[PDB]
Every structure is written in structure tokens, then in C-alpha cells.
Design a protein around this nucleic acid. Structure first.
Lengths: 146, 170, 106, 51, 125, 151, 197, 33
RNA sequence: GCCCUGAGGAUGGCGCUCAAGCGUGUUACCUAUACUCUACCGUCAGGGUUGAUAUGAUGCCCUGACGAGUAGGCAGGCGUGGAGGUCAGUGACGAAGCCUAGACCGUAAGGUCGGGUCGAACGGCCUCUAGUGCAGAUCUUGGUGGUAGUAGCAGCGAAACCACAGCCAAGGAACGGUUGG
RNA sequence: AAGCUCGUAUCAGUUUUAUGAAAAUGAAGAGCUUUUAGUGGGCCAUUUUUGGUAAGC
RNA sequence: GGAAUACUGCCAGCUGGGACUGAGGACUGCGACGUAAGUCAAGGAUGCUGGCAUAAUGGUUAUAUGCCGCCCGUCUUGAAA
């Protein structure tokens, strides 16, 4: 599981990244299911993440995203010339989803403001836990963390 | 707080078998994910369908028809414990099906030590007329002109010291 | 005439501490008449003054005062955290403290 | 660099000429005096003997 | 000059472990090489060993509370070097300077407006 | 000054902080009766007249009622009460920041205080017990909960 | 709220009462406990009596006196129960205990002063109805206490002449209420009623 | 030198997503079916 | 399902019974070096810099991450004996050393100054040099204590031993040296 | 540690796919001579066992 | 027959109470208001007020006390011992 987490750039707690849904990636998520929680983010959550904790990787440097010019200089090759374009590409998986995901630095999230909401985190979400696959509650979890 | 959900699956229709039996059942759960997981578990146990070849056609929430009408609920429950699995039947006088199933779960976790993991709700039905109830503790509340007091009320104190010597009269 | 008090008397319980570690920089203060965090929310930002008598006279008076402020609520019993310019001696556990109404918003 | 620093040096030297102000308005009655430890000893043990 | 507030990150001398308990052990810090030593393992409740974390800020480094860097002065010629850095450096007279030279040095420092870190040294008014 | 800087000092970067006027709380309205919390006149009920340009409130006892003269009091150190007294008949435009400058009481200050007291005494007497209420000081008693009391 | 609080220990649980008194003591509040002999403990009498024996059976061999001390007075038992709830052997704990006084009955001048009760520690408010309970006075008498007779005898006198004081207070309040009634319906009374008084 | 977090301080928010002004003026967030 | 039988001590104690015991579900709150934002030290990596810099391009700065650790490796520094050079250095108006319930500077090795004794050499800096830095080695030379004014032969007067020591209860490989009395 | 060729297609404590050889994620810090300190103690514990009877072992 | 409310999610919706931080150092850039001149919360705080030379304040010793901390070095065994 550690190798899969490293491949997904989940090198520290309260850190997450966008992963394309595929038959191969589903197996990877199942492998690291105990140690991670994932779901189906909505447009609002993706926009909030890209707006607040949106950091881009430029020549091995985690340059914060604060201007459309920054995205255009690096991501303008594929037609992504604004933060809105990046958000649209992330939410709507397209031909250049991989490049956009790689460019974005792994998100650094804090602990939930209202708490995880369960007495024991290390349990399946279907039984009052935290990890697993929470379809829509992932948005609420991220918003509290973000 | 529990909730009632309806889940239907038809095992990913393939060639020569369009629109399979379309198994239908009602699942009580606190969220859609738990309802889907319980539906999958029930399909695996009772039926031969597993999530490998399964498919969730649609999940919907059912609201009680009369949330302000008192009803007597008869519930058939099959649950597993340290011993072998066995059937069980109980009668609950509640207002809504969700409240009745929640009370049943609480009683099972209290008396029989059975929790949501090993409890199955086979069927929930409403008892229409009197004298069909088979439990004395439910018949207790069906008596005409039922009046009783509430002796020894546990009054709450907002301060450590009270210069009154409170009385528990009601 | 009979009373000139313009502050709400309270009690200093103890510093913010764990089971075996304490943080003197933060002090817990109990306010009379406060039972829930919502009630204590009104006292946030109020100046806290501890008044005690000193053996020596320095500025023409025998009373020395240490000032502080209310930071945030603590627990569900109305306890509110407080931070002072200089931490309390730790001998004032249960000592009476004064909470003023300024800076006021009402 | 040279022009700016030369101007700064000239200004500092000119404002250092204010020393005349201290010399013009000193009227001091202290005139820093230094006492050697040997003189201190002769002003202490002899004082004790005289007492 | 409103210089940045001086932060030291530490005010207690990093006394050597067991220095107080044993007289023969000097207070000068010396890292414990003991494999089983608790201090070497920085156990809770023990003294805090020096480390890079306590590094003082570059801008506030070598800054006295008055905000002027200390500079040793041995004679009037040495003091003259601080003519263009009076606001940033403070003259400090060596302990070996006699009163006869000290008075002259102080007079020149006052004339040039250079603050003296340790005045009234061996001089009585 | 003509003197060039004798030493190299870095100039301050262009600051961008406009001096926006104070956004006073709604409860503070001219003519409202105020209660002092801290200072020489702590606990003395006073009246609100005008808002000064230095983010301070011009408050009069009135002087003839409780002895409090025209003074500058910070808004944060004042409790605003629902009671109000007419102030349209009292002239306050004359007072300003320079009025309270201090360069044995100034005669002009006394005359202004007398004029203000004369103007405001009629309004104070317009309601019963208002003069007595203003004269009486404010203090707390056992069982008083400021977070529950209404002002 | 009060410089000194007098708590009536009659019909109260030893555990909850001791815990609340200790917590108040740690907060700098002076408390005086009265009528200790009337304190009650949950459970049947035999269980409480058996419990007492097993804590005094541990007498130290080499030095019994310097070892455990067995006190029979109900006030001593209550103090021992409260002592363990406070961080003793420390200056903070020792100072707090100085604020607590325990007496059998209501010795003066506390007999002439108001007393309070703790609602959360009342036996008739916490224990389930019909359940067995033990009385501290009877347990103390069984385990060696010899002052129950005198305690009851001089507590009966406490009620004596205090019933008379209450009768005099009732007579005075009769006239007070009459004066209030005859003073009602007046302009001042009407204004007070309108203003919530 | 300092990161200006959007979703607040509308000034920086208007720097990115120039459609924010249209969204706010048109009240598109509460659009009705 | 719960309860009883059914074979010097501690749920830690105080203690508790619609529990402050048991099972379940929901909210309310405490914190670790854990995580989010920011101030600072250093390492790495990248980058800017000159018809010269409003500070030694071995200079001055911008950007991102990182910082546990035994032996070992690399890098940068503190202190002393002496030597070449250097401050046309300090110093009987007091050099070195020592003391200091004095302060200052550096994360530290250490340096500076304030006050007392002291009296005649020593230091700021670039290099060279080594009999160059002590907490122990049942270490060596020297000095001083507990035992002890004790054993011992009114007076004279040790030695063995000495990290820390004799009120106790549970458990931390019989390890025994945190909850109470 | 120094050198050369360099940033890639050099790879993976990963997944699918294929055959019974083609993609996903991440890293472009990868490849070839020379030598240079230290390193061959084991405990806890699942599964096989080495097989079994009060048990261990 | 008809609306309302509960729940979920959104608001580039509005507006109060509290705590820490003030980092950079003459403009170069992204932006907003404004027909324009100009202004702005736009790559890090500004203005005003009160205390002060027999000062303000700060530094050292012990005791006053909230909590923690086994006696140091070498060596056995994978560890403690």
C-alpha cells in the first residue's frame, strides 16, 4: 500500500490528489482502501480546492497559483490558459487530464474544522468509520478539512 | 437517525437474458452508501448475485405516508448472534416505520446484544384493527380511556446549590 | 453608593493542561453567572484584572494589578480561556478575579 | 556610488563641526577624574587608621 | 530607526548536563556521547540541547538591546572608523584602556556623536 | 531639510492603507444616554452629543446634573442605552479636535459648558425622573448578569 | 455567590456530595457540611458494613498506628471519602481541605444561619424508587460510633425553639402580607406591577 | 510575497475569473428554473 | 440478554447503582513534536546580478522543499604553548591571573565589557607549528571531608567503607529503588 | 568520493493487459570504469512445519 | 385542490462578536472603481491618542507554587537488566 500511495503522491496525512477513474486505478484504490478515503467531488468542492490550495509545479518549484498568466505560461501548450480552464479540465476529464493533474501540486489539507464526526476513524465508512468509499460525503469532508 | 431506502438490481443484463428478475427490496440505513452496502450483502446472502456482476438500477428514499398517525407495527426480524441464526417477530407501537425500526434496533442491541451488523429487516407491516396484536405490552396501550401518572419526576438542576429542597411531585 | 462594582467576579481554575503536561501561557477562568459557551461568548475580549495586596509600597499604593484578556471559550461549563501579559503565579488557583465590561459592544 | 558617498561623508563631517556647540556651551564642573587603585588604598586604610 | 523587534528564541544558558550536581563538571556545554544517555536521546523533562533551530535572525543578529552593533575600540584612531556608522554601531572600550586614554576616547566619541556601550569606566566625576 | 542623509537608510515602500472614516455601531446615536466604564468618571451616566473626527465621542453630563463636563470618550469604553434625549436643540458643531487641545480652568470652556447645560436641561426635564436617573451612578449588584441584562 | 456555603447533608449521597464539595473546594469556595450522621449510602446495610471491615482489616504489622487509621465518626468517614477525591500530599490540596468543615448535626452558630442542599446529590432524587439504602449514622454506630444517642438528643433540641422561631417568622409575614395587600392597588403599586414588580 | 486567498477579499477574486463580476451582478447563483 | 453458584490488595485511588456498571445511536468539549497558516537558523536545487554594485561577485538578493538517528564519511567553526608578519597596539593614570545573588554577543564551543584583590606583561587579525582542550581509566602527584571526637590507649586519637540510602502496600527479565497508607 | 557518457524512455516492494510480448500512475536524481569506512547480533510475531499427547516440545 | 415547512447541496449572497501574526522596504506586474482627471481592501500597516528622567521598563539569588524529570560512564544479551 505504501508504494501505491507514493505513486498517488499521498506522501503525508491529510493530503490528497485527483485520480482518474479506470479499471486499473480502481484496483489501486481498492488496494489502499484501508488507508485512504475517496468519493465523487462536486464542482463547488473542486473550485474551492483549486482556489484556496491550488499550487502548481513549475520547474520543480511549488509556485502558488495567483494569476492566469502563471497557468498560461506552463499549461498554455494544451489550451489551458486560466484557472477556470484548469477547473473545467479537472471536473470534466479530457485528453489532457493527466497533464493538468501532474502540474497541480498535491493538496495539503488540514484536519476537519468540525472533526471527523466518528469515534473511531480506522473503520469502513459503511460502519461509522472514516476510510472507504464515501460517494457524496467526501465533498463535506473536504470542505470541513479545507 | 435511520432512513428508509429502496434498491433494485438486475445483475448487469447480458445476451439472451434481457431485463432479469430485477430483485427489489426495502433497506433501512442512515445514508445511501450504507443502504447500497446492505443491499449488496443481502443479495450475496439470500441470492446468488454479487457486486462483481451486479448493478444498482436506482436508489430512492421512501417517506412514511402519515408521519403524524399512530400505528402498530409488526416486524419480522432474522438476526445472528453467538448462537445459530433464528427468526424473530416483534410488535412496536410507533408513528412511522423509520422510528419503529430504530426502536427495534435499539432493543436488539440492548436485550439480545445484536447490532446493525447482524440484523435483517424481513418485513414491516401495520396492524389495522385491535385484537390482532399478539403482544401483551402492546395491548397495554390499547385500553380505552388510558390514564396514568408520572410519579417521581427527575427534575434537572441548573445550579449546584438550591435553597429549596425540591420535591419530585408531578 | 452601596456598591461600586463595574466588573463580573470570577475564579481562576488552572492552566490549560493535559493529563501530565501544562501550558502556563493559557489560564482557565470561571465567570459567575455563565453556564454555557453561548453565554461566555459575550465575555470574549473583555479585560481581566487580578487584584492582590503587596507587602511593599512601590507607587504609593499597596495594590498590584495584573491585566489580561479573554481569548476563547473552554469546555461546556462556561469556562473561558484567558491570556495575561504575565502568567498567574499558579498559587491563585481558585482566587477571585475581575472581568470588566470594556471593550464593550452592547 | 562615489558621488553619493562623498556627499554623505561631507555632510557627516560638516554636522560633526557642531562639536563647537558642546565646547561653546559646556560650563562643566565635573571634568572627569580618574583615581588609581593605589591612591584608593591610601585613601581607605589611612582613613581607617585615622578613625 | 525602528528596527525589527529583537527575538532571541532563548534566554537561558545551555548549561552542561549534571553541571550543578557535580562540581568538577564545568557549565560549558558538551554533547553527551553516551549511547544509553537519556540526554543524548532528548527525553522529556531533561535540559534542551542546543541546535540549529535556535538560530537568531540575520537582521537582528549581533544587535544589542539599544539596537547598535558592538565594536571594540582601542584608541581614537579606531573610534574614528565609526564616523559613518554611528547609528548602526556602538563603540566599546577595551577593559585594558587606562583612564587617561579613556577620557580622551570618550570626549572624541561625544564630539562625533558615537554612543559608548560602557561609559564611566574607571572615571569618576 | 537641506541636510542630505548622513547615513544610508532604506526608504519605506509605498503603503496602501486609506484612512477610512470610523464605522460606528448602530446603537451609538446622538442624544443617547451613555454609561462610562473606565476612567475618572467610571460608572457615571452621561449623554451622547457628537462624534468627533478623532474617532472619539463628545459627551456631556450635563455638567450641572452630575458634574461631568464636555469630555472625549472612546466608543469601545461606553455602553449605549436604548433611552434617548432630544439633541437637535443643542449646538455641538463648535466643538472639534482642536477645541480640546492643551497647548485654572479655561473661561471659554466653562461658558460653553454652561451653554450646553442650559440647552440640554429642558430636554432632560422633558421626561420625568430623567434628571434623577442621570444624576444616579451605575453599579452592579448580586445576581446581575451583563450577558442577560438589556441596555 | 456566597462567602461560605452551609450544606445540609441529611438525605444526601456520600459520593456525589463529597465529589461536588471537593470540586468547589478546588475552586476556592468555603463549604461547611452539617448533619453528617444523616448521610445516606446506596445499597443494603450489610454490604456497607462488610465494605467497612475490608478496609480496616489491612492493619500494618510493624506499625499499626503509623499505618491505616480507622475513624468511626460519620464526619470523619465523610472527610476520608472526600479526602481521596482531592490531590492530597500537596500544598494545593492541603490548602483546599482547610476550607471544609464537617460536623455532626448543626452546631452553632451554623444553627442560626441558612443552609442549602445539592440537588444532584439528593438520595431521593438519584436512587431508583424502592431500592435499598444505608444510613451513615447507623453504619457508624455499628462500626463503633458511640455518640449517636447524644447527637439525636441534642438535635431534637435543635428543632425545639426553631419551630417557635419559624412560628414567629410566620406571624410576622402575616402582618407583612397584610400591609402589602392594603398597600396594593395604589398608583405606585400599579406602576410596579406594570414594570414587572 | 503573500498569497491572497480567493473566495474573500473580492479585489483579488476579481483578478481571476473575470466572469465573477457578471455572476455577482446577474445573481446567477440563485438562478430560477 | 443481565445476576448468583458453578473455586501486603487494588477498574489506580477516591469511589458509583433510572451508574459514575453493560450494549447501541447522535451531538457538546481536551490535547501530541500529528495536520493547516505565518516569524526565524541552516542544507539542497534553480535563478538574477558588470560599459559595475547607493557592502569583500568568496559580495547582495528571489523562488520550493527539507531538517529523527548509533558507528563511519563530508563540511564549517571555538580554545591554548611557540614562531613569521601586522595594529608607529594595550599597560604603574595598572598587562596577566583570580573572584563576581552583573550585563552584552553567538544555537554552542567561547568572546566583550561593569565592580573587588592583584601586580609587569599581554592582546586585535593572515598564516606555520603541537608534548593543543578531560567526567571516570579499582589512573598518577598533591590537598580536604563523612565515618568521628567513634574504635582504641581526664587527655591523645584511627581504620574498612563512602554515586545516591534506610517506615511500608500492588505491578513495573525473581529487575527493584505510578496509585496510597 | 572523483571521471565519462547525460535525462531520459533509466525505471517501479504498484495495477491492468498480453503470451500461457501493450498500457495507467510517479519520478526525468538514470547508465559504465577505480576504490572507501563500517557490516556475517538477534528478539517479538503469522504461515509451513517435525510429528504428535493432558500439555508443552 | 393548493401552497408552506423539514432534509440535502449551492450562492464569484449580506452582515456582527473573539484570538495571533504587521513578515517585505522609493515605482516597475496582475487587477477593480471612474467618460476623464484620478482613486482603490490590487505582489506583507498605516494615522491618531495616553505613560517617561528622583522614569517607563528590564536583568540575578532563594523561597512562594500548576506539571514533568529513575544516577553518571564502559561492557554483556535482540533488550531492559
Amino acid at each position: 500500500p505504501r508504494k501505491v500511495l507514493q505513486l498517488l503522491r499521498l506522501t503525508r496525512i491529510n493530503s490528497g490528489t485527483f485520480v482518474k477513474v479506470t479499471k486499473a486505478t480502481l484496483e489501486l484504490l481498492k488496494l489502499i482502501e484501508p488507508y485512504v478515503a475517496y468519493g465523487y467531488p462536486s464542482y463547488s468542492t473542486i473550485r474551492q480546492l483549486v482556489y484556496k490550495r491550488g499550487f502548481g509545479k513549475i520547474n520543480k518549484q511549488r509556485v502558488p497559483l495567483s494569476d492566469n498568466a502563471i497557468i498560461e505560461a506552463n499549461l498554455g501548450k494544451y489550451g489551458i490558459l486560466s484557472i477556470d480552464d484548469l477547473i473545467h479540465e479537472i471536473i470534466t476529464v479530457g485528453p489532457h487530464f493527466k497533464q493538468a493533474n501532474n502540474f497541480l501540486w498535491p493538496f495539503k489539507l488540514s484536519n476537519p474544522s468540525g472533526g471527523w464526526g466518528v469515534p473511531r476513524k480506522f473503520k469502513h465508512f459503511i460502519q461509522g468509520g472514516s476510510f472507504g468509499n464515501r460517494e457524496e460525503f467526501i465533498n463535506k469532508l473536504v470542505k470541513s478539512m479545507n | 437517525h435511520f432512513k428508509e431506502y429502496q434498491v433494485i438490481g438486475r445483475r448487469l443484463p447480458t445476451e439472451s437474458v434481457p431485463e432479469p428478475k430485477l430483485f427489489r427490496m426495502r433497506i433501512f440505513a442512515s445514508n445511501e452508501v450504507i443502504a447500497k452496502s446492505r443491499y449488496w450483502y443481502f443479495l450475496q446472502k439470500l441470492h446468488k448475485v454479487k457486486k462483481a456482476s451486479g448493478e444498482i438500477v436506482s436508489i430512492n428514499q421512501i417517506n412514511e405516508a402519515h408521519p403524524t398517525k399512530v400505528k402498530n407495527f409488526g416486524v419480522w426480524v432474522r438476526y445472528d448472534s453467538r448462537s445459530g441464526t433464528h427468526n424473530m417477530y416483534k410488535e412496536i407501537r410507533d408513528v412511522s416505520r423509520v422510528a419503529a425500526v430504530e426502536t427495534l434496533y435499539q432493543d436488539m442491541a440492548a436485550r439480545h446484544r445484536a447490532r446493525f451488523r447482524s440484523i435483517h429487516i424481513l418485513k414491516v407491516a401495520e396492524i389495522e384493527k385491535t385484537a390482532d396484536v399478539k403482544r401483551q405490552y402492546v395491548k397495554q396501550f390499547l385500553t380505552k380511556d388510558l390514564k396514568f401518572p408520572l410519579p417521581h419526576r427527575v427534575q434537572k438542576s441548573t445550579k449546584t446549590f438550591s435553597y429549596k429542597r425540591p420535591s419530585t411531585f408531578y | 453608593a452601596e456598591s461600586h462594582r463595574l466588573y463580573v467576579k470570577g475564579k481562576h481554575l488552572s492552566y490549560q493542561r493535559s493529563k501530565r503536561v501544562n501550558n502556563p501561557n493559557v489560564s482557565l477562568i470561571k465567570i459567575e453567572g455563565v453556564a454555557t459557551p453561548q453565554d461566555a461568548q459575550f465575555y470574549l475580549g473583555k479585560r481581566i484584572a487580578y487584584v492582590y495586596r503587596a507587602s511593599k509600597e512601590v507607587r504609593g499604593s499597596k495594590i498590584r494589578v495584573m491585566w489580561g484578556k479573554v481569548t476563547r471559550t473552554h469546555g461546556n461549563s462556561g469556562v473561558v480561556r484567558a491570556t495575561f501579559r504575565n502568567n498567574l503565579p499558579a498559587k491563585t488557583f481558585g482566587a477571585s478575579v475581575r472581568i470588566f465590561l470594556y471593550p464593550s459592544n452592547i | 556610488f562615489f558621488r553619493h558617498k562623498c556627499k554623505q561623508r561631507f555632510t557627516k563631517l560638516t554636522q560633526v563641526m557642531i562639536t563647537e556647540r558642546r565646547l561653546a556651551l559646556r560650563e562643566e564642573e565635573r571634568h572627569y577624574v580618574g583615581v588609581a587603585p593605589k591612591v584608593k588604598r591610601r585613601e581607605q586604610n589611612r582613613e581607617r587608621k585615622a578613625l | 530607526l525602528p528596527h525589527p523587534k529583537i527575538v532571541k528564541k532563548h534566554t537561558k544558558k545551555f548549561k552542561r548536563h549534571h553541571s550543578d550536581r557535580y562540581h568538577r563538571v564545568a557549565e560549558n556545554w558538551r554533547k553527551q556521547k553516551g549511547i544509553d544517555s537519556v540526554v543524548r536521546r532528548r527525553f522529556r523533562g531533561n535540559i534542551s540541547q542546543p541546535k540549529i533551530g535556535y538560530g537568531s535572525n540575520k537582521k537582528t543578529k549581533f544587535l544589542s538591546p539599544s539596537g547598535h552593533k558592538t565594536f571594540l575600540v582601542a584608541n581614537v584612531k579606531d573610534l574614528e572608523t565609526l564616523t559613518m556608522h554611528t547609528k548602526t554601531y556602538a563603540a566599546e572600550i577595551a577593559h585594558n584602556i587606562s583612564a587617561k586614554n579613556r577620557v580622551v576616547i570618550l570626549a572624541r566619541a561625544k564630539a562625533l556623536g558615537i554612543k559608548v556601550t560602557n561609559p564611566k569606566g574607571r572615571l569618576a566625576l | 531639510p537641506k541636510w542630505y542623509p548622513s547615513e544610508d537608510v532604506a526608504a519605506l515602500k509605498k503603503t496602501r492603507k486609506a484612512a477610512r472614516p470610523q464605522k460606528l455601531r448602530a446603537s451609538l446615536v446622538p442624544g443617547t444616554v451613555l454609561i462610562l466604564l473606565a476612567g475618572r468618571f467610571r460608572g457615571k451616566r452621561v449623554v451622547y452629543l457628537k462624534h468627533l473626527e478623532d474617532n472619539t465621542l463628545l459627551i456631556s453630563g450635563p455638567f450641572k446634573v452630575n458634574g461631568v463636563p464636555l469630555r472625549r470618550v472612546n466608543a469601545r469604553y461606553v455602553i449605549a442605552t436604548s433611552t434617548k434625549v432630544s439633541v437637535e436643540g443643542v449646538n455641538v458643531e463648535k466643538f472639534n479636535v482642536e477645541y480640546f487641545a492643551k497647548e485654572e480652568i479655561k473661561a471659554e470652556r466653562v461658558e460653553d459648558q454652561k451653554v450646553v447645560d442650559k440647552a440640554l436641561i429642558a430636554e432632560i426635564k422633558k421626561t420625568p425622573l430623567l434628571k434623577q436617573y442621570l444624576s444616579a451612578s451605575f453599579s452592579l449588584k448580586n445576581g446581575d448578569k451583563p450577558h442577560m441584562l438589556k441596555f | 455567590v456566597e462567602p461560605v456555603v452551609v450544606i445540609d447533608g441529611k438525605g444526601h449521597l456520600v459520593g456525589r456530595l463529597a465529589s461536588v464539595v471537593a470540586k468547589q473546594l478546588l475552586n476556592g469556595q468555603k463549604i461547611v457540611v452539617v448533619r453528617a450522621e444523616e448521610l445516606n449510602i446506596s445499597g443494603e446495610f450489610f454490604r456497607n458494613k462488610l465494605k467497612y471491615h475490608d478496609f480496616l482489616r489491612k492493619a500494618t504489622a510493624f506499625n499499626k498506628t503509623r499505618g491505616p487509621f480507622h475513624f468511626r465518626a460519620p464526619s470523619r468517614i465523610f472527610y476520608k471519602a472526600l479526602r481521596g477525591m482531592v490531590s492530597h500530599k500537596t500544598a494545593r490540596g492541603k490548602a483546599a481541605l482547610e476550607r471544609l468543615k464537617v460536623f455532626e448535626g448543626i452546631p452553632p452558630p451554623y444553627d442560626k444561619k441558612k443552609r442549602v442542599v445539592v440537588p444532584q446529590a439528593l438520595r431521593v432524587l438519584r436512587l431508583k424508587p424502592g431500592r435499598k439504602y444505608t444510613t451513615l449514622g447507623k453504619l457508624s454506630t455499628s462500626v463503633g460510633w458511640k455518640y449517636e444517642d447524644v447527637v439525636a438528643k441534642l438535635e431534637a433540641k435543635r428543632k425545639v425553639s426553631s419551630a417557635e422561631y419559624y412560628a414567629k417568622k410566620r406571624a410576622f409575614t402575616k402582618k407583612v402580607a397584610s400591609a402589602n395587600a392594603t398597600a396594593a392597588e395604589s398608583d405606585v403599586a400599579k406602576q410596579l406591577a406594570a414594570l414587572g414588580y | 510575497v503573500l498569497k491572497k486567498n480567493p473566495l474573500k477579499n473580492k479585489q483579488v477574486l476579481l483578478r481571476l475569473n473575470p466572469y465573477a463580476k457578471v455572476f455577482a451582478a446577474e445573481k446567477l447563483g440563485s438562478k430560477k428554473a
